[PDB]
Structure formats: C-alpha cells, structure tokens
Amino acid sequence: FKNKTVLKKRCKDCYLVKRRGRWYVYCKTHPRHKQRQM
Amino acid sequence: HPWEPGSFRVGLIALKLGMMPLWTKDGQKHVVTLLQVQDCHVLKYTSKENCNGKMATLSVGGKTVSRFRKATSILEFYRELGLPPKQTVKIFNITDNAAIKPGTPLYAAHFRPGQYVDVTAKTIGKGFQGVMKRWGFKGQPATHGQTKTHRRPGAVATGDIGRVWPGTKMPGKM
Amino acid sequence: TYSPLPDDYNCNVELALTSDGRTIVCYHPSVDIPYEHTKPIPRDQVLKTRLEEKVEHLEEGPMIEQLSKMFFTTKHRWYPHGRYHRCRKNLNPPKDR
Amino acid sequence: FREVVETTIIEGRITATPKESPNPPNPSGQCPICRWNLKHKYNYDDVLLLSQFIRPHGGMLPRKITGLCQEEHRKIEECVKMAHRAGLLPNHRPRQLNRYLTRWAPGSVKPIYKKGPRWNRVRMPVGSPLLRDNVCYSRTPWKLYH
Amino acid sequence: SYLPGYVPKTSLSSPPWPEVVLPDPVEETRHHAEVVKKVNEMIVTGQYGRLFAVVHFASRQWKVTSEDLILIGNELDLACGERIRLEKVLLVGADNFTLLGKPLLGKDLVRVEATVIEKTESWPRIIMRFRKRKNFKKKRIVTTPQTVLRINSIEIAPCL
Amino acid sequence: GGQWRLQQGLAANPSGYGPLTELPDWSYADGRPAPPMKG
Amino acid sequence: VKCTKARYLKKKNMRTLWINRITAASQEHGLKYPALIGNLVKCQVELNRKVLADLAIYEPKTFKSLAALASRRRHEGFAAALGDGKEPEGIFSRVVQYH
Amino acid sequence: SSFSRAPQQWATFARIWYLLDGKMQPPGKLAAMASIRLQGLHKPVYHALSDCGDHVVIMNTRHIAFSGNKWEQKVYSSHTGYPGGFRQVTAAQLHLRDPVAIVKLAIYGMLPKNLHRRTMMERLHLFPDEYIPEDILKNLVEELPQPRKIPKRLDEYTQEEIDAFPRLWTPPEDYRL
Amino acid sequence: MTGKELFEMWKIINPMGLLVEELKKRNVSAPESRLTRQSGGTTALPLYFVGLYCDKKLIAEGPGETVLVAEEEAARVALRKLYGFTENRRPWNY
Numbered sequence A: 001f002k003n004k005t006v007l008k009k010r011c012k013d014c015y016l017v018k019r020r021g022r023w024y025v026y027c028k029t030h031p032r033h034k035q036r037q038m
Numbered sequence B: 001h002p003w004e005p006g007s008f009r010v011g012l013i014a015l016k017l018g019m020m021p022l023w024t025k026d027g028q029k030h031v032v033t034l035l036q037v038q039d040c041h042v043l044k045y046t047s048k049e050n051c052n053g054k055m056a057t058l059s060v061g062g063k064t065v066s067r068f069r070k071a072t073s074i075l076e077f078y079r080e081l082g083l084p085p086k087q088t089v090k091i092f093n094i095t096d097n098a099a100i101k102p103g104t105p106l107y108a109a110h111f112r113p114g115q116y117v118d119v120t121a122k123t124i125g126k127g128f129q130g131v132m133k134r135w136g137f138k139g140q141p142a143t144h145g146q147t148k149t150h151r152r153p154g155a156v157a158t159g160d161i162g163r164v165w166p167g168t169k170m171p172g173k174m
Numbered sequence C: 001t002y003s004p005l006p007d008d009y010n011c012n013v014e015l016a017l018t019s020d021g022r023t024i025v026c027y028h029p030s031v032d033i034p035y036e037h038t039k040p041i042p043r044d045q046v047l048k049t050r051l052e053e054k055v056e057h058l059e060e061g062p063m064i065e066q067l068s069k070m071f072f073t074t075k076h077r078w079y080p081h082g083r084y085h086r087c088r089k090n091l092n093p094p095k096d097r
Numbered sequence D: 001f002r003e004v005v006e007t008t009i010i011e012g013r014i015t016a017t018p019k020e021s022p023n024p025p026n027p028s029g030q031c032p033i034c035r036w037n038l039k040h041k042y043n044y045d046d047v048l049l050l051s052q053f054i055r056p057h058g059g060m061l062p063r064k065i066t067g068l069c070q071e072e073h074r075k076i077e078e079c080v081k082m083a084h085r086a087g088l089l090p091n092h093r094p095r096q097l098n099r100y101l102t103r104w105a106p107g108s109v110k111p112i113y114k115k116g117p118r119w120n121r122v123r124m125p126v127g128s129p130l131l132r133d134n135v136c137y138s139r140t141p142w143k144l145y146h
Numbered sequence E: 001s002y003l004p005g006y007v008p009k010t011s012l013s014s015p016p017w018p019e020v021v022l023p024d025p026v027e028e029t030r031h032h033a034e035v036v037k038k039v040n041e042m043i044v045t046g047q048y049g050r051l052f053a054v055v056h057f058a059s060r061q062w063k064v065t066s067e068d069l070i071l072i073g074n075e076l077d078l079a080c081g082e083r084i085r086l087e088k089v090l091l092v093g094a095d096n097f098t099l100l101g102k103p104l105l106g107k108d109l110v111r112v113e114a115t116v117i118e119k120t121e122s123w124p125r126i127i128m129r130f131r132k133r134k135n136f137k138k139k140r141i142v143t144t145p146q147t148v149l150r151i152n153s154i155e156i157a158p159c160l
Numbered sequence F: 001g002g003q004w005r006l007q008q009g010l011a012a013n014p015s016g017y018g019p020l021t022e023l024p025d026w027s028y029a030d031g032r033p034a035p036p037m038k039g
Numbered sequence G: 001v002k003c004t005k006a007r008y009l010k011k012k013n014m015r016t017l018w019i020n021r022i023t024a025a026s027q028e029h030g031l032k033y034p035a036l037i038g039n040l041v042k043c044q045v046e047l048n049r050k051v052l053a054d055l056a057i058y059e060p061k062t063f064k065s066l067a068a069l070a071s072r073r074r075h076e077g078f079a080a081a082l083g084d085g086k087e088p089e090g091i092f093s094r095v096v097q098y099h
Numbered sequence H: 001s002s003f004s005r006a007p008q009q010w011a012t013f014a015r016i017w018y019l020l021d022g023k024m025q026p027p028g029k030l031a032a033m034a035s036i037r038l039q040g041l042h043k044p045v046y047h048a049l050s051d052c053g054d055h056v057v058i059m060n061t062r063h064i065a066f067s068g069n070k071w072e073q074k075v076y077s078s079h080t081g082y083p084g085g086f087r088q089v090t091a092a093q094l095h096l097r098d099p100v101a102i103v104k105l106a107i108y109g110m111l112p113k114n115l116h117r118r119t120m121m122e123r124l125h126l127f128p129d130e131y132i133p134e135d136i137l138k139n140l141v142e143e144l145p146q147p148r149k150i151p152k153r154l155d156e157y158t159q160e161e162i163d164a165f166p167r168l169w170t171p172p173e174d175y176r177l
Numbered sequence I: 001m002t003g004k005e006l007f008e009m010w011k012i013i014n015p016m017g018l019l020v021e022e023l024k025k026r027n028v029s030a031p032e033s034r035l036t037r038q039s040g041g042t043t044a045l046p047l048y049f050v051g052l053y054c055d056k057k058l059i060a061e062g063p064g065e066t067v068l069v070a071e072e073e074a075a076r077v078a079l080r081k082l083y084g085f086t087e088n089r090r091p092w093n094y
C-alpha cells in the first residue's frame, strides 16, 4: 500500500473500502494500486 | 493427597555450608553449593480466605536459637507448638492439597537429585559503596591532569531538568 | 388534585390569595410520622463478675489508623501540633446563643 | 413475506405479511415516517421503530422497499448501529463493556493519547450528527462532542 | 381513528416532564377564600405563638423575632430608649401559617415595634492603599456610627 | 428579574422608585410621622 | 491592604454562600435556584438571598411554602405560554399595580 | 422544635449514608451526585469549615456505562516518577484491572482541590458488584434515584406496547426479508 | 428567663417517669417508644430519632447518639409540650 490523502481508483477492478476507520483502495488484479488513507 | 497437575508444595530452609567441586561423566567440573537442612519444622498454616492472597501459605522455620534471646510473643508461639525457637521463618505459597500439619519436620530428601530449585537469601553486605563498586561506573582517568576526581559520578542529570531523576544510580549501601 | 409540591415530607402547604389580591396566605401544618412507618425500639457460677477492664496500649501508628477507620478521616487530624499553634489557640472563645 | 426451503429441491413460499396500520394521521406524507408524524421525534432507544425497519439478523432493509426518504433512511441506519452497540436488539443478532450513543465501530478508534491545547482539543464524539435536528425539549442543545 | 397530529409513543414525541393541570379558577377562588377564612380564624382565636417577620430597614432586610437585637449601620435621629414602629414588613410567619406581602404587608395587618437602646460607634476600620515601586501609600481610619435596636413585639391582626 | 420588572413598568432594580424604597422606614410608636429620610 | 480589599471579598463570598444554601434547599424541594428566584420575583416577593437562606435554615415550612409558590408561578407561566391567547391571567400571576 | 441544645446540634450536623447504584449509568453523573453529597453542598447548613459531608455508597461500579466511544478513546495518564515511567491506559484497560477506579477518579476530579478532599474520599465507599458489607447496609438512609433511565431492550417490551405501536410501512409480500 | 430552656432552669432526673405520671393523671395511655428515623448505627457517630406514641398517635420526638438518649430527649420534648414551656411558645408580654 501507499499512503495517500486523495485516493484514486487506477483500474476498473480497484475497489474503495473503509476499514479500521480509514478508506482504502484494494485491487486483486494490480496490487500496486493498493492505497491507504492518511 | 496425591500430586495433581498444577499443584505447589512447601520448601525448606537450609544453612549454606559451602562449596565443592562435582565432576560429571563427560568430564565437566560443576561447582556446587552444599545447603544443610538444620531443623526445618512447619510452624503454621493459613487458608486462602484468611491469607488475603490467591494461595494458601505454610510458615516454615529453620535453625534453633536461644529462648533467652527471643521475645515473649515469639516464645509463646513456640511453647504451644512444642518446638524450640527458630532463627528464620519463611512463608511458602502452597495449594490446598499440600497442607502439612503444623509442627512437622521437613528433610533434605523433600527434594530429589536432578531437580531444579530457587534459592533466596540476603546477600553479602558491602556497606556504603561508591559508583564504581555499586553500579560499575567507569570512573575517571588516573593521570593526564585530573584534579580530585577519579572514582566519582560525572554528571548526574541534565541542566534543563532542574533536579535529579528518581532512581539515579548514586553512591549508597550495597 | 393539583399539589405544587408533594404533601408528605414536611408540611401540608396550602396557598391562597386574599380577595384584594395584595397578600398571599400560606397554611402549612406539620406532617407527623405514621406508627405504621416507625420501627420498634431494639432490645461465672462461683467467682464474682470481675470487670473486663482491659485497655491495650496501641502505638501511635496503629492507634491513628484505628481512629481514622473509626471516624472515616485521615491521619493528619490525629497527629499532634506544636507549642506555637497550641498557645495561639483561644481557650476562652466568644459564645453567642 | 417470502421464504426459501432447501431439502435437492428448493422452493419459495409466500408467508403472511404485516400491513400498515389503518389510518395515518398525515396521509399526504411521502415516506412512512412523514406519514406518521415522526420527522424529528425518534432516537436510538426507539427499537419499536428500528425493529420495523431492520432485517431479522440485524441488517437494514433497502430504501426502495421500506419507502423511507434518504434523510430518514440514513438516520434509521445510524440509530440501528447505535442500538446494536448499546445492546437493545438482543434477538436481531448475526449468523463486557456497557455502551450507549456509540457512533463509531468500537474496534476502529484509537485512544486519545495526546489531547491538545484547550483551543485545539481532541474531543470524544458522542451520538450522531444526523440527529442534530431532533426535538430538544431543553434549553441547552445536544452535545455531539464530549 | 388517529386524530390529525397523533405522534406514536417514542422517547422524543412527548415532553419529558409530566403534564400538569392547574386548578380551575372558580373552585380555586372559593378554596382560596376557605384557606384565608381558616387562617383568619386562627389569628382571631390566637392559635399562634412566637411570630417572626422579615422587615425592610436601612436598605437592608432583617429576619427578626421578638426580644431580638439588630445593629443598624448609621445614626437614626432617635434618643436612646425610644420606641418606634418598623413599618415595611415583607413577611410575617408563624408555626402553621405565613403571610406574604406583594411586596409589603398591610399596616392594618402587622405592626413591628422596636426600641433604640444604643447609639454607638464601630471599632476602627483601617483603609490602606499601597501600589508597588510608585511611592504610593495612604492610611485612613474610619468609625461608622451605629444604632442597636431591640425588636419588642410582632403583633398580627385579623384583617384577611 | 430586571427584564420582567421593566415589562411590568416597575423599574429594573427593586431599590428603584417603588414603595419598598420610597415609603418611610419607620414612625414613632404613638403614630407620629418620622422626619423624612435623607436619600 | 488585605483588610481593605477583603471588605469587597467578604461581600462577594457571603452572597455566594447564600446562593449555595438556597440551591441546596430548592433542590430538596425539587426546584432549581433560577426557578425559585425568578418566579418569586414574578410573584412580587422581594425577599433577598440572605433572608431566603435564613428561611431555608430556620423556617423550613415557610421555605417549602415559598418553593410551592414559585413552583405554581412557573406552572402558570408554562400554561400561559402554551395557551398563547387570552385565557385568564392566572391567580398568582396577577400583578398588584402601584400609582 | 423544642429540642435540647446538644441533641439539636447533633441532629443538624449528623452524617447521613446515601446509596447510589451504577448498572448502566454514566460514571460522571454518578460522580456529580456523589461529590455534591460528599461535600455537603445539598445541606442548606453547608459551609466549607463545618465538616458537613455525608457518606456515599456506590454499588455496581463494574457495570457503569460510557457514552460514545469513551471505552477506547478516554486515557488515564499516570507517571511513576522514574525515567520512562509515563503510563497511559484506556478506560477499558483500567476497568478490567480495577473495577472501581473509573468512578473513584471521576469523583476525585470533581471534588474541590483542597486538603478536605481525601477526608471526603474516605467518606466515599465503592463496590464493584451487588455485594455491600452488612455493616454498611445497616447504615443506609435513602437510595438516590439513578441519573440515566435505562433504555429498555426490545425483548423487554410487553406485547401491549408492541401492538400499541403502529406498523408504519407495509412490506411487499414477495420480499425475502 | 428570656432565652433559656425549661430543663436548663428546672433540673429533672427521669423525664420518662415524670411523663408517665402526668399522662396517668390525665387519663392517657402510656407512651410507647418507637424508632422513627435512624442514620449510621454501626458507626461511632449515629443519629437516632425516637418518637413517643400514645394510642398510635405521635406526641413527641427526639434525637440522640444512642436510642436511649433519644428516648430520654423525646420524653423531655413531650414534657415541654405538655407543660406549655416550648421553644415556639408565645413570648412574654412586657
């Protein structure tokens, strides 16, 4: 994951999920698109 | 009662007799301390409800000392147990299945060889000792200009905290 | 059916106004406790009955802890004070009613 | 309602359904709440209302089926979350610290180790901001931040 | 048939305080007349003893009873031992009843009588001003005149 | 209760222009009017 | 200097003590202090806080009568506010007028 | 009241034992109504120099309820004055170690910061469960009412209340629910 | 005798006996002592309010540190009420 203030979906398989009180971008096809809200 | 898993028995009080070599079959020297059990007699039992604590207790006493040099209450306690006065009494936290009737002799063979034990005693007193013996401080150099400063603590703290922190390793009784 | 306050703990308050409207009249007779609400009052063959006069002397620490537990206070009340304050105290205090 | 039974044969059966109570006091209203004059008069305690709008195992029912407006639906959702956390719905359960007015999921807040200065103070949120327009019945407003 | 306005019983539908119905004014006026008659008959018969009063005097309010001593903080232009009538009585009360003025009770209803028994001075009061580093220091000593009055009688009359 | 007293026209301070401040404090017990107060 | 300024401080602290004792007695009657004070002024009773604390301590039946009077005045105020029209004023809400 | 001088003083300045219950109750509301009575601020004979406090006995301090997320967000800070001895424990962790500590600390923080505070705190008694010692139980006068009314879980509602509340919406008769 | 109580001027020994003698001489049943109010009890600072009842009607009440000092007091309050020398009585007319 990479820490980001603005989260962006870089594929059509990227999904925004809020867990542990923070939004997250998870991608099961391109895991480089993993993103953590700061 | 028989030994159930998770139980806890009593211990003894032994006089430290000394030290001796002991060689094992591989040819390894293994110094050993000789602890002699003088007159260990269980002296008191306390139940979990009375002993405010999570286990019962069994007071055990060691060496026979002089009645003439003991106190009336201690001397009255030993009169009702029918035993001479002991030097030290220690409290051994035991489960309820390990209660031994007060006034009962404990022997060295309560322990058995090849076993592991914990030994508590007061350490040798060194008096008021400085930082080099009490805490391993490095001291200061002998020559090269030093004024009356060779075995002293250096700074004890920093200038911003206008005090000395609690627990600072300073000279004292060792 | 209206009571400004409940009428069962001090007095039976009745408020009124005079016909001119200039003064307020309060009638407050006392409320008495009911008997049903009360409780009843709570209730060596050969020798003489020697008086059981024992007074164990307690040291200062245990005695102060015993007094603190008895009266629900702390220890500082029971420690002494010195001669300056002790002679400073007024031993002939002003008494009104 | 409708149930599905698996015995391999699976079949759907229609079961008895509740109906709306006969005469709403405000028939011109648009969502069930508006109709029954409950615009700002319901809290997390009102499980006799939250139970009407939840699923049997604790989840919420969707808006196109309950008829609720978006404002109401989000307020009901937050009230149901707070009721579940307070423990007021013991039979709507899935598959000890007493709480009430719990906004966030209790496993997802971090401790306030560094409260700030009295001018930038990290407050503790209490209740829900969605219920700000609820009727006060008091002369001090609700305190959403403790 | 739910009337137009029925809010179902939720926690914030109804006010949290109980609903209070005040007495109807006609029967309450009659009850007030009965209470006033009872207290008036109590005054006529004399079913009281040791009245107290709240009396406005010298910008101050004093709760006084008979045989009492009050210290007035100025001179009053009366010779010692002189009997005067305290006149602005806010309240007079007894065991089992109390009479409340709005704000002053009738002089046909209550009399407070007092006696000047002392015209004295206060003990010296020190007024000292001091400001640091500005050579400022001043001392004045004052003694306020004072007048002790004894409350003698509090008498109520049947006038309600 | 100053705003309420103003709404009834009775000043705002109860030590202002009413009978409670302007009536004489006392009188002689025989009934003679006292000399007028200085304030 | 401390003696000279402690005159002002004595007056302030004595008023604070009276307010505390009046609050205690009103809460013993289920009333709050602002309610008692405001509704007694509305009842045109001009007892000050010194004598109100004194009545709280030494004449508790008189103080319960006063707390009842303030409670009634508050209830009449609430009834008038909800009525909003021209219902009769309320028996204890009438104001004796002076000219 | 026609009492003698000594029994009248004794009655006026006597000490009263009040019982307060926790059980689903905000710690600080318990603490407010406890600190008033420990100070003696509820007596109209109150004065800071009259030793007029009362005994307060608080039961079920293990079952207090915090509003919001205070169970994980509140932190009780302490320092054993050794270097590195700053400790911070959440409200949940302290409730799990000492079940009376939270209520005790709230009452202590609400008491006046004078030298009369620990005397009042010795007149306070706190018990984690429904057990109170017999001697304390035989000293009580007046159980105070509880600050929070307890919201009443859904299974506790009577069928009269359930069928008195109107059904707001009609469900579609084909939904799986 | 202005601000003084009766038993501060007239010293008595046993007010319960004096009270039962006066009740007997006016055809009234003997007073039963009953515990009306109680605070503490186990403590070293208890408060007891003992009330004296006659035909289940309260005639007097008194406080004390013991139940027995409260009953003596309640008897003294009853005696003051019956003899008319009470605190709330009408003051002397001078």
Ligand SMILES: [Mg+2]
Binding pocket: B138, B139, B140, B141, B142
């Ligand atoms: Mg070296």
Ligand SMILES: [Mg+2]
Binding pocket: B147
């Ligand atoms: Mg040199």
Ligand SMILES: [Mg+2]
Binding pocket: B146, B147, B148, B149, B150
């Ligand atoms: Mg050297």
Ligand SMILES: [Zn+2]
Binding pocket: A009, A010, A011, A012, A013, A014, A026, A027, A029, A030, A033
């Ligand atoms: Zn992606």
Ligand SMILES: [Zn+2]
Binding pocket: D030, D031, D032, D033, D034, D068, D069, D072
């Ligand atoms: Zn709507």
